[PDB]
């Protein structure tokens, strides 16, 4: 019922900082998984531990 697009249309400095944290954290998390997803042996070792 309340659907609108002004929230995406309206941008504040706090909101700007919020989604800029969002994309930089997406990028950091992304390189983290990109390096992690290739060798499950260390994960198996730490799971047994």
Q: In the chain, where does DSSP find H-type helix?
A: 6-9, 13-36, 40-48
Rounded to an integer, what distance in angstroms lies between the CA atom of residue 24 and that of residue 3? 28
Q: Cβ of 5: how many Cβ atoms within 10 Å?
A: 7
Q: Which two tokens stand for residue 43?
A: 């994960």
Question: Å resolution of this model?
Answer: 3.9
Q: What is the DSSP letter of 38?
A: T
Q: How was this structure determined?
A: cryo-EM
Rounded to an integer, what distance in angstroms lies between the CA atom of residue 42 and that of residue 35? 12
């Amino acid at each position: 019922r309340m659907l609108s697009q002004e929230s995406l249309r309206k941008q504040n400095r706090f909101s700007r900082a919020s989604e800029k944290m969002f994309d930089r954290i997406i990028a950091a998390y992304g390189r983290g998984l990109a390096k992690v997803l290739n060798h499950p042996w260390l994960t198996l070792s730490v799971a047994l531990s």
